[PDB]
Amino acid sequence: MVLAPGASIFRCRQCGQTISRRDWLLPMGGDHEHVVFNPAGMIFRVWCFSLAQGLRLIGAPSGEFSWFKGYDWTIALCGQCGSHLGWHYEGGSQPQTFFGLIKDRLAEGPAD
Template sequence: LILCRACGHELALGTDIRSVPSRLALSSRNDTLLGGRRVNVQLFENPHGHRFEVITFRKADVTQHWPSDKRFSWFPGFSWTVATCPRCNTHL
């Protein structure tokens, strides 16, 4: 179970984690979740110099804030959008 750190809202199940490696990642590591499931954590940097650790999911309960966009994606072939927790609006 993946929870929002700010409010505890259930965002996704561990079975929803989907490994999507990106050649644009600054680094990548495998972590182990509770229960022994392995997850690929990748580090990215946006044009403003902000760094983000990213885990990819097949689906998640999040609020999307504008239509998804393929430009500037860290995952070629995929689109992105800002996502927040639907309960507390914390940036995810």
């Protein structure tokens, strides 16, 4: 669609690991962005993606405190540097799985 796009790929902000792409943004409940808080009171602006790479999913899934009805989550770390980038969601419906990534922990930039 455009030549030399600068808003193509999302990398880990801390190390540059390739994580996702703007093309893979997923409008869960009508919006790719969901503003949420955890039990420790931390607020996250979470962007939902159909796909991601370069992460390491830690532990078994849990349904507790899930921000997305019908989904269980696993912590998603940057597979390169260990930065906590978000969560992988599974066990739900349409889609069965997706990633919720913390927007401000990613850097956006040109394709590879």
